[PDB]
Paper text:
The nucleosome is the fundamental organizational unit of chromatin and comprises two copies each of histones H2A, H2B, H3, and H4 wrapped by ∼147 base pairs (bp) of DNA.
The cryoEM dataset revealed two additional distinct ubiquitin positions on the nucleosome surface, denoted H2Bub positions 5 and 6. The global resolution estimates for these EM maps were 2.93 and 3.06 Å, respectively, with a local resolution of ∼2.5 Å for the nucleosome core and ∼5 Å for ubiquitin. While the ubiquitin in H2Bub position 6 lies closer to histone H3 than any of the other H2Bub positions, it does not interact directly with H3KC79me2. The density corresponding to ubiquitin in positions 5 and 6 was sufficiently well-resolved to unambiguously orient the ubiquitin with its beta sheet oriented towards the nucleosome surface. At a probe radius of 5 Å, the occluded surface area between the acidic patch and ubiquitin in H2Bub positions 5 and 6 is 890 Å2 and 1119 Å2, respectively.
Residue numbers in the entry:
A (entry chain G): 14 to 118
B (entry chain C): 16 to 118
C (entry chain E): 39 to 135
D (entry chain A): 38 to 134
E (entry chain K): 1 to 73
F (entry chain D): 28 to 122
G (entry chain H): 29 to 121
H (entry chain F): 25 to 102
Amino acid sequence: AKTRSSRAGLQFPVGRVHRLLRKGNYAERVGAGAPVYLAAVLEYLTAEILELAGNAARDNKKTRIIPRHLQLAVRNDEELNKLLGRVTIAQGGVLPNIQSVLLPK
Amino acid sequence: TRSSRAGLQFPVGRVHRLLRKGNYAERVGAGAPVYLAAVLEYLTAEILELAGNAARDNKKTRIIPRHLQLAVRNDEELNKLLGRVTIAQGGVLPNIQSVLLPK
Amino acid sequence: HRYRPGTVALREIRRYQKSTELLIRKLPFQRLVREIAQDFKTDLRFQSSAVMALQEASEAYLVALFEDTNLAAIHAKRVTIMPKDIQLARRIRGERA
Amino acid sequence: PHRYRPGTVALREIRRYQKSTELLIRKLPFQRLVREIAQDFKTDLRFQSSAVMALQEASEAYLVALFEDTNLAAIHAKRVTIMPKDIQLARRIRGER
Amino acid sequence: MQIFVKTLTGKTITLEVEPSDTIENVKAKIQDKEGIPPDQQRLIFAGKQLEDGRTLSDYNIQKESTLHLVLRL
Amino acid sequence: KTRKESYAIYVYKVLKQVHPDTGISSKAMSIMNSFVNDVFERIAGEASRLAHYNKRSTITSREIQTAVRLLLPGELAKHAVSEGTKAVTCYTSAK
Amino acid sequence: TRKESYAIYVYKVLKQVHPDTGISSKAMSIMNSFVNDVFERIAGEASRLAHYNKRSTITSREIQTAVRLLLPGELAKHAVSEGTKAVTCYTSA
Amino acid sequence: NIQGITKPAIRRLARRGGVKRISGLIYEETRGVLKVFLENVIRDAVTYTEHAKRKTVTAMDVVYALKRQGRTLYGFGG
Amino acid sequence: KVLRDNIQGITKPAIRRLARRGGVKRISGLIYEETRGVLKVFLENVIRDAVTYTEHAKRKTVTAMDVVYALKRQGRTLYGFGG
DNA sequence: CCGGCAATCGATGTATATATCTGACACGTGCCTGGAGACTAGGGAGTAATCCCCTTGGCGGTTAAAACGCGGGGGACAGCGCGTACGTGCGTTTAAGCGGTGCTAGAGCTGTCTACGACCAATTGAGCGGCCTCGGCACCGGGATTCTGATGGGCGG
DNA sequence: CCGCCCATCAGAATCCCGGTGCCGAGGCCGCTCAATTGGTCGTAGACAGCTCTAGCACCGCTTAAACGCACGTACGCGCTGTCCCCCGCGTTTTAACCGCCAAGGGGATTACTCCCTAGTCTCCAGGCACGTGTCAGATATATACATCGATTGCCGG
């Protein structure tokens, strides 16, 4: 155990997050566990979005993920939709939706 | 004092201290507090002028939050600036849709 | 005598658009606030100023919502406001998904 | 002579354009319009291609959302045609001056 | 066409000048109507200090515009 | 009884400069205090972000001017910029 | 000049979640922007929290309260669990 | 206790909003929307209170929560 | 070179395509002029902010970072063009 | 013996299967810059103890608001008719898009040196808390003015 | 001759005036702590110079998209009738609001300590720029299936 990420068992960097915290003009001092907490949270959110996007990509018989799959993943989940409410994803598109009145009878 | 040198009413030293102990940047220049104090005093004077006119309209000698609300809501620039702000004990502007009025 | 319908309504519109008082009784609002807060955490206390601020914010929110509802009702060639107008206003504003 | 009834090709186009992701505006006219607009604030300016691309993406997203709100407002008034008053109502309720 | 000059004392005065009028002429009018000497007045418009040799049309000062007067001692 | 600071005296001085015979109540004073604090925070945050973008360690009058231009709309920005420039010039001239 | 980014860590997370899919170049840019945005939001809220209570340090309590304030209902619980587990593991080792 | 928000109070709020005629089903909707708004604000305020290790909710917590939601409120110490 | 008339380059079929992506079936004939006005207002605001950002940095070229910063300032975040 | 309803059938649009190639994604290498290990010094934050202030809980009364009922007029909704504006299609015209070519303005990097901001110490006056006093504003009673709706009247189909 | 439009009355409703009182705003005094002045030092940033890159301008050719015109239909808008449901008013109930009293919990301050974080130096390895191979996906072609709208047959009035 040499790096801090290995000690915490993460994939995201702890030292880089600590450096960004210390130079972003946020507070006079930064505690030891704050980078660990922040890195864990960021890794969790990334994992959630990537899992949903990968399922969407598989639904289309595709291998690689494109911004369309990210847009489909975000817009179909309530929590992610609330979080990314005022965000525009480039080359994303829209969810297919037609009002019931316009359909033929 | 620095306000006397700049010919202002608002405090320059206090603004400088607030800038330095607010975690905004590593260093703060000499003219930034002067500029900021001047701008703040100008905005205060504008709002107070409008509110005082509103207070005089109602035959009153003291300004109350209703007068501040009337001053802010009747000016386009101030309404744009304070667009998402609620003033306590302020009220609303009188406005009735023309469709609801009797024929 | 008797006033025709719609007159006293306009009188109340004029009267309440000029005052600045609070339009909801204080004890019911206090009770509602306490029972709402008891879900997130029990054994809690409130300053009087906290309840006053809550009442002011909620009243302003409701008044603005009713203004938008009246606009939506007028758009549909009506003078009566209906729940669908509230739903349309909330949906367009962004609160309702 | 084969001919479709009104409203069929409209639904087909709705289905087509809600499934793709390309830009729906020609690039040269938009570039010219952006340069003309920017000429008011400061002359002899230059633009990266990425700047114009980002501007186009933002504009298209804004217009699409506005049209969705306009469609909702039009349906609220028991109609299928969108009209300028629907655009005005949506913009007013959204808070845009 | 008419413009408004603001002083540090909150006093706003009205001036009747022309688009082709130079800043020196505007100044001369301000002394005539207020008694303030030529050397002491500094004019600020849109964050820029005006030059006596320039005209009002040079700085795009339109009708009912406002300029801030600075006294230099 | 810990000392608590505010902007009351300066607001009253400005008011007496504008309307020589006019008072103010306590609630209006609270509202004015909140307004001044809010505008201060907005301008300071915008200037700090501007300094961060261009890789600078100092906040200068240029950052304040650009923040005022970005935040204040219309003629408010013009008049505020003129006032700030005049104040800075007067401060520099005097010593 | 060297330019740093989150690409490698995002790719490692993806290979851990879906070990067969890939990612394109624009999706990587979107993910980078997302990570930066969330980082800035949480850090700003934590700094404001520390300023309110007259403290000169940022600890894990500020981060926990920040993620409780920002993240919606069901995301917050799992995020808090992950952060607490990571901090406990770091302290133990 | 949501029924303590009586129908005449809602009518007075509507009058201040400029509404002339009111349907009979508006009061239930108004109660629901008010409850949702209060729940959000009170949740945020209680979180702010618990971070400070206090057992009393102050006006500062309410002001901070409202500012977080995007509704600044003047006149209570902001 | 100063150019005008360029708002008419946003043709009627393009606005129709945008409406189709918006889910609209029938369009009145007066929608296009108002759409042009709305687009003009939006572009004016964003471009003003971007130019302010550019001139603070003493540059003669508008970059994508300035556009992203302006859009974030107006409360419209955009993912993909850096940031 | 036609009308409405339901079952065909041709045209058309869209999804599916099969090479083909190509530009983009995934992997391999050097180095250099930032992160980790070890140690020291100091101040920020935790902990304990006091105090007194504000919040909670209970009691009595009074009176103003709320709840309930009734009668009626106006508005909401459904149905019908008309006419015009918008959708679908076709032939013609235009400019967007692609592919090169050249040129130059300007963005980005590097070295220097200097003025500007931080830090430290002593001093002193501006601003905050506490106390008083009086005048602007709230309250009550009375008169004046203003709409508003019923009543009488006049008129034209 | 009678339904529709117009002028005129009393009656609540809001407002203005005058007298009374009373509580909050404006002013004054003492102290303390934060802003001012003077001096020293280090580095952040302005300035000059050079390099190369990407943004701008011009030309030629294709062809797909835009534009103009015609025809028909289906949707929007206006009118009419009804039916019921909100509004205005009167009576009875209830509980909010005000005043008063009492107790105790917890918020705010102070003193002390210790341990967690910053700062310094050394060392080394992880991540970024660069370069290369190959395969996932876009393209072109052929084909099968679903859908829509006109045609026609059948039960029924």
